[PDB]
Amino acid sequence: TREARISRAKRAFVSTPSVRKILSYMDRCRDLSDLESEPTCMMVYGASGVGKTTVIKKYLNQAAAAAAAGGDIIPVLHIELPDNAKPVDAARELLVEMGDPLALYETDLARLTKRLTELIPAVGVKLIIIDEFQHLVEERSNRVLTQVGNWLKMILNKTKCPIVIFGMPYSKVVLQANSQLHGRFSIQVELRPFSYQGGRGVFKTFLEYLDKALPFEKQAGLANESLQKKLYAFSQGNMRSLRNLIYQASIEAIDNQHETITEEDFVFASKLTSGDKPNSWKNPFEEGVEVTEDMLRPPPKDIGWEDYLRH
Amino acid sequence: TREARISRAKRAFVSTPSVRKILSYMDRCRDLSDLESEPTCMMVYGASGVGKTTVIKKYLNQAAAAAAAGGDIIPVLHIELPDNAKPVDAARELLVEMGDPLALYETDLARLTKRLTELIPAVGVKLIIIDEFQHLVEERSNRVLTQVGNWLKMILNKTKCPIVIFGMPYSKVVLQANSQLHGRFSIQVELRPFSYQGGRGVFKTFLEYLDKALPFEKQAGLANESLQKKLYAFSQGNMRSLRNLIYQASIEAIDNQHETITEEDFVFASKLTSGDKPNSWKNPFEEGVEVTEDMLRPPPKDIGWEDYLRH
Amino acid sequence: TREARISRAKRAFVSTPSVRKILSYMDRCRDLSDLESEPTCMMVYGASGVGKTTVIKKYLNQAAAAAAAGGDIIPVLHIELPDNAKPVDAARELLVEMGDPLALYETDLARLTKRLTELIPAVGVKLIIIDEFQHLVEERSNRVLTQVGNWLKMILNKTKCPIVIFGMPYSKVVLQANSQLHGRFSIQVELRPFSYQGGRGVFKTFLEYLDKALPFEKQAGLANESLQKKLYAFSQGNMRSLRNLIYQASIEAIDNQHETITEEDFVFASKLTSGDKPNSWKNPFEEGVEVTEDMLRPPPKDIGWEDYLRH
DNA sequence: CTCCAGTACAGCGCGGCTGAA
DNA sequence: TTCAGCCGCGCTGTACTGGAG
Numbered sequence: 004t005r006e007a008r009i010s011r012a013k014r015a016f017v018s019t020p021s022v023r024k025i026l027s028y029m030d031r032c033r034d035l036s037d038l039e040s041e042p043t044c045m046m047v048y049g050a051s052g053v054g055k056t057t058v059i060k061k062y063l064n065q066a067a068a069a070a071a072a073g074g075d076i077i078p079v080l081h082i083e084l085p086d087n088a089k090p091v092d093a094a095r096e097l098l099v100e101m102g103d104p105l106a107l108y109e110t111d112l113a114r115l116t117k118r119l120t121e122l123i124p125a126v127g128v129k130l131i132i133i134d135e136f137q138h139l140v141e142e143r144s145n146r147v148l149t150q151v152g153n154w155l156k157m158i159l160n161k162t163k164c165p166i167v168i169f170g171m172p173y174s175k176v177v178l179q180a181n182s183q184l185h186g187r188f189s190i191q192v193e194l195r196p197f198s199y200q201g202g203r204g205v206f207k208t209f210l211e212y213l214d215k216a217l218p219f220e221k222q223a224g225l226a227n228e229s230l231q232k233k234l235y236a237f238s239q240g241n242m243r244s245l246r247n248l249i250y251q252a253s254i255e256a257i258d259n260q261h262e263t264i265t266e267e268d269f270v271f272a273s274k275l276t277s278g279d280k281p282n283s284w285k286n287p288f289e290e291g292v293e294v295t296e297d298m299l300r301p302p303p304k305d306i307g308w309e310d311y312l313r314h
Numbered sequence: 315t316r317e318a319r320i321s322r323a324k325r326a327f328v329s330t331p332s333v334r335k336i337l338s339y340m341d342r343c344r345d346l347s348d349l350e351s352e353p354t355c356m357m358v359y360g361a362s363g364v365g366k367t368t369v370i371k372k373y374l375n376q377a378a379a380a381a382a383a384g385g386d387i388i389p390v391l392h393i394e395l396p397d398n399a400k401p402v403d404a405a406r407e408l409l410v411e412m413g414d415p416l417a418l419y420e421t422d423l424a425r426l427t428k429r430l431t432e433l434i435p436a437v438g439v440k441l442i443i444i445d446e447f448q449h450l451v452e453e454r455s456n457r458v459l460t461q462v463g464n465w466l467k468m469i470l471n472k473t474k475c476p477i478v479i480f481g482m483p484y485s486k487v488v489l490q491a492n493s494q495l496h497g498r499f500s501i502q503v504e505l506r507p508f509s510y511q512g513g514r515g516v517f518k519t520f521l522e523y524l525d526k527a528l529p530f531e532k533q534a535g536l537a538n539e540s541l542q543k544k545l546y547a548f549s550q551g552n553m554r555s556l557r558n559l560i561y562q563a564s565i566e567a568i569d570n571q572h573e574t575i576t577e578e579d580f581v582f583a584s585k586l587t588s589g590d591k592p593n594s595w596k597n598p599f600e601e602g603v604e605v606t607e608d609m610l611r612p613p614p615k616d617i618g619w620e621d622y623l624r625h
Numbered sequence: 626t627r628e629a630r631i632s633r634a635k636r637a638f639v640s641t642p643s644v645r646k647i648l649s650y651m652d653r654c655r656d657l658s659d660l661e662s663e664p665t666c667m668m669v670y671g672a673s674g675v676g677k678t679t680v681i682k683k684y685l686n687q688a689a690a691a692a693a694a695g696g697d698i699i700p701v702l703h704i705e706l707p708d709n710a711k712p713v714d715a716a717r718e719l720l721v722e723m724g725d726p727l728a729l730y731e732t733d734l735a736r737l738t739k740r741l742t743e744l745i746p747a748v749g750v751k752l753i754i755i756d757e758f759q760h761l762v763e764e765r766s767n768r769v770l771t772q773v774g775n776w777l778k779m780i781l782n783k784t785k786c787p788i789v790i791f792g793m794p795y796s797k798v799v800l801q802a803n804s805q806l807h808g809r810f811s812i813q814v815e816l817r818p819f820s821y822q823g824g825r826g827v828f829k830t831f832l833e834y835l836d837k838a839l840p841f842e843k844q845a846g847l848a849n850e851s852l853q854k855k856l857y858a859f860s861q862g863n864m865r866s867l868r869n870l871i872y873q874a875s876i877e878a879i880d881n882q883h884e885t886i887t888e889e890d891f892v893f894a895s896k897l898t899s900g901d902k903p904n905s906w907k908n909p910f911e912e913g914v915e916v917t918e919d920m921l922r923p924p925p926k927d928i929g930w931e932d933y934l935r936h
Numbered sequence: 937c938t939c940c941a942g943t944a945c946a947g948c949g950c951g952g953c954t955g956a957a
Numbered sequence: 958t959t960c961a962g963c964c965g966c967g968c969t970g971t972a973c974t975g976g977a978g
């Protein structure tokens with residue numbers, strides 16, 4: 004097996020120009036705030052499985068690894084809101100993640116607001132990264148509860164510290180709900196999936212560098228005329244479903260001692276990771292699926308909106 | 315009586331290729347997660363009485379018997395959600411099943427989420443098997459309450475541990491409810507009942523190996539021209555109703571000292587376990603039920619959907 | 626008076642072949658479950674006043690009298706659900722009936738589920754007999770609330786103990802409501818009333834053995850040409866209305882010192898217990914009610930359904 | 937004892953069915 | 958076909974109950 008080789012296939016990061024744009028703007032957002040005047044506050048959108056959590060994890064490592072190794076400083080944070088969050092819930096989650104208070108027994112919303120304003124300049128917080136902002140949309144109704152948003156404005160004005168709120172595209176309406184919170188978050192970037200297959204696009208060079216990064220020694224056959232077309236046909240732009248297929252195909256080619264990833268175990272990987280794919284979608288690998296013009300259209304505008312459009 | 319022989323007739327496991335497919339994928343799901351990166355997360359559908367709980371019990375024994383005998387390690391779990399589950403309810407059920415906390419007095423959903431994230435790497439959890447996923451569908455309305463699904467996504471991202479959620483086929487819409495939870499559960503397998511009678515199929519060899527496994531010494535007469543047609547006519551594919559009929563017929567042949575299972579006590583067993591069978595269905599054993607072409611059609615597509623279609 | 630003789634007239638049990646069928650199946654249901662594998666789980670239907678409660682009381686005495694006299698063991702139970710039962714209500718009723726916990730102050734549905742799963746193998750429960758299953762049908766609307774049914778499935782799978790749920794025939798739709806609970810209850814028997822008067826049927830020999838069992842010394846005159854026709858004409862099959870008439874007639878013949886039950890006090894007993902009988906029904910005892918062909922028809926199919934058909 | 941959340945009952949508004957013009 | 962009245966369903970407000978501070 005060699006679980007070292009398996010972990011190498013699973014942990015494969017390839018930097019796209021969109022990710023380098025987000026990382027450059029994140030470094031800019033941090034280094035601009037003097038923690039006296041109002042910070043910059045970016046909002047990053049992005050659909051279900053574009054690689055937002057990978058972007059935050061890549062930034063976390065490249066920013067706070069040596070500083071966290073130095074001592075209890077924790078310069079940048081990573082916060083994942085709970086579903087249907089109250090201000091007290093997201094406040095105490097921000098508290099128990101940041102350093103080591105108890106913080107989650109005494110829930111009174113005011114004294115723990117005083118605690119984390121006492122503690123944010125104490126440890127030396129430089130940035131707050133919130134991952135889930137679509138949790139502030141109520142599930143079955145379409146009201147967006149503005150208590151956490153107003154509390155985020157409150158904690159932003161009280162202690163001037165830049166906040167980079169991530170979320171799905173339909174979380175925009177939560178920023179539309181509060182006009183003051185809308186005005187604060189000026190910088191808005193859309194981390195949207197891969198666009199076209201025509202070739203010599205960002206998708207080809209991405210698969211070229213991922214072909215390089217794969218733990219096979221000789222070639223993996225990606226980013227050619229035939230296989231790129233089949234690959235985009237399987238996974239439209241969704242980075243997770245593409246990486247899942249590539250991961251299952253790699254560990255399949257590792258299991259039965261092979262040269263590389265071939266059109267032997269790729270078909271098996273396609274039939275394995277095609278459960279989540281929609282009703283009308285066709286698997287382009289099986290017996291005789293001539294990959295069509297209609298399969299390779301760019302992803303829509305409302306790609307991450309559909310759950311909001313379902314009600 | 316010899317309750318040893320009765321327990322032998324009751325505890326009879328025959329491995330079908332569909333069950334071996336599920337077990338191979340379950341072993342694969344476990345041995346792929348390094349518990350740093352995102353796990354694989356299979357979803358196994360299956361109708362009312364296909365042998366899902368038998369699959370989980372067979373896997374539990376063949377995985378965790380010697381490791382549980384070694385000490386308090388509990389590598390794999392078995393969770394059965396309560397009906398109309400809240401995240402706190404399914405969270406504390408996951409807690410009180412896993413090891414020995416108290417965990418079911420202090421219900422605050424946040425500190426017991428912290429407790430089970432503290433405790434999951436502590437004991438060394440390798441896999442979580444959830445049995446009931448159709449409970450998240452509300453009974454009389456058709457809304458699917460997405461609090462437990464969003465909490466399952468939360469606990470999946472917080473502590474990277476593979477979850478194999480079992481459920482009835484109409485629990486698919488609960489996975490369709492959350493687009494992120496849909497994306498996560500890529501591997502989907504359908505454990506569907508037995509297909510055809512025409513003979514030399516999986517049903518014949520299944521009854522051949524179950525004929526072997528029965529505690530009678532000489533023959534039980536199963537998987538021949540006549541009796542296989544009558545057996546499929548009684549129980550379409552439903553593994554439980556077939557096994558119940560075979561069980562009641564076996565213990566009937568054990569009661570009055572007999573050679574084997576014959577067409578003496580099988581008729582009695584048919585009239586015994588025909589209460590649950592639908593209105594238009596005919597018992598093929600009684601006096602003169604010429605077994606027809608129309609009785610031996612394969613089971614439908616929406617076999618485990620009917621309760622969802624009833625409202 | 627001699628209240629000994631009065632109690633002898635009131636407490637008269639005559640075993641029919643349908644009752645002996647139910648008792649043989651109950652003994653079978655108990656002695657088959659090894660409390661490791663899935664139990665047998667019979668469902669027994671029956672109209673208003675067929676003698677279900679008498680069957681459970683007869684079984685309770687003949688099973689658990691000496692074992693309850695030995696010590697706190699309580700092998701078999703007797704549960705009567707409350708009307709519009711919640712799982713917590715029927716759960717704590719099951720708890721406070723079984724042994725001696727407190728169990729009915731702390732209502733949280735999860736920890737008392739843990740309590741009775743802790744306690745069922747502790748005392749040594751071999752069988753659970755639930756008497757009222759038609760309470761899960763809502764009164765004025767026709768929805769059947771499936772929380773107690775899903776909890777019964779939960780407690781059946783958690784602690785493998787055979788459950789014999791009794792109820793009225795229109796409670797079948799509650800078993801039709803849950804396809805998993807339908808599957809589980811394979812053995813379904815219909816304890817339906819007495820059928821015909823033509824003579825030399827089960828009704829004649831039943832009145833013959835009840836004539837024997839009555840506390841009069843010489844004869845009671847039952848199960849002859851004339852009186853059997855008048856008896857069926859009064860009470861179609863309803864065991865309770867028949868036994869009530871016989872009871873009132875007996876204690877009338879005991880009051881004024883008489884030879885036996887004659888056509889003197891039987892007429893008075895008929896006019897006494899004819900309040901519940903329907904509008905078009907005629908009392909066949911009064912002055913000149915020539916007992917007709919149209920009176921002596923067998924009871925209908927939907928005998929215990931009428932309250933469901935009323936809405 | 938007070939505040940927040942969930943459940944049940946009552947009132948108001950909207951949609952569907954029935955009766956009248 | 959349109960308007961009005963009655964019934965059913967959904968939303969809102971109100972009171973009662975349970976949990977939490």
Ligand SMILES: Nc1ncnc2c1ncn2[C@@H]1O[C@H](COP(=O)(O)OP(=O)(O)OP(=O)(O)O)[C@@H](O)[C@H]1O
Binds near residue numbers: 018049054494
């Ligand atoms: N640049 C990249 N190169 C290779 N793989 C990548 C890259 N970016 C993301 N991935 C992979 O894409 C997958 C998506 O995971 P990730 O959680 O980051 O997506 P996400 O959008 O945050 O998901 P969600 O919206 O559900 O939180 C991961 O398996 C990750 O390894």
Ligand SMILES: Nc1ncnc2c1ncn2[C@@H]1O[C@H](COP(=O)(O)OP(=O)(O)OP(=O)(O)O)[C@@H](O)[C@H]1O
Binds near residue numbers: 326333368
């Ligand atoms: N491979 C097998 N060989 C023999 N008997 C089997 C096999 N698989 C399942 N059974 C039998 O099928 C019956 C169904 O049990 P099980 O509870 O596993 O089904 P299920 O589909 O999980 O039911 P439910 O979905 O209601 O929980 C059991 O009596 C079991 O012994």
Ligand SMILES: Nc1ncnc2c1ncn2[C@@H]1O[C@H](COP(=O)(O)OP(=O)(O)OP(=O)(O)O)[C@@H](O)[C@H]1O
Binds near residue numbers: 640
């Ligand atoms: N075999 C029998 N011989 C004589 N009397 C009988 C017999 N079976 C039942 N009875 C009498 O029939 C009457 C019916 O009472 P019982 O409560 O058993 O009926 P039931 O169907 O349970 O009523 P319910 O459905 O309302 O609970 C009792 O008075 C009982 O003594």
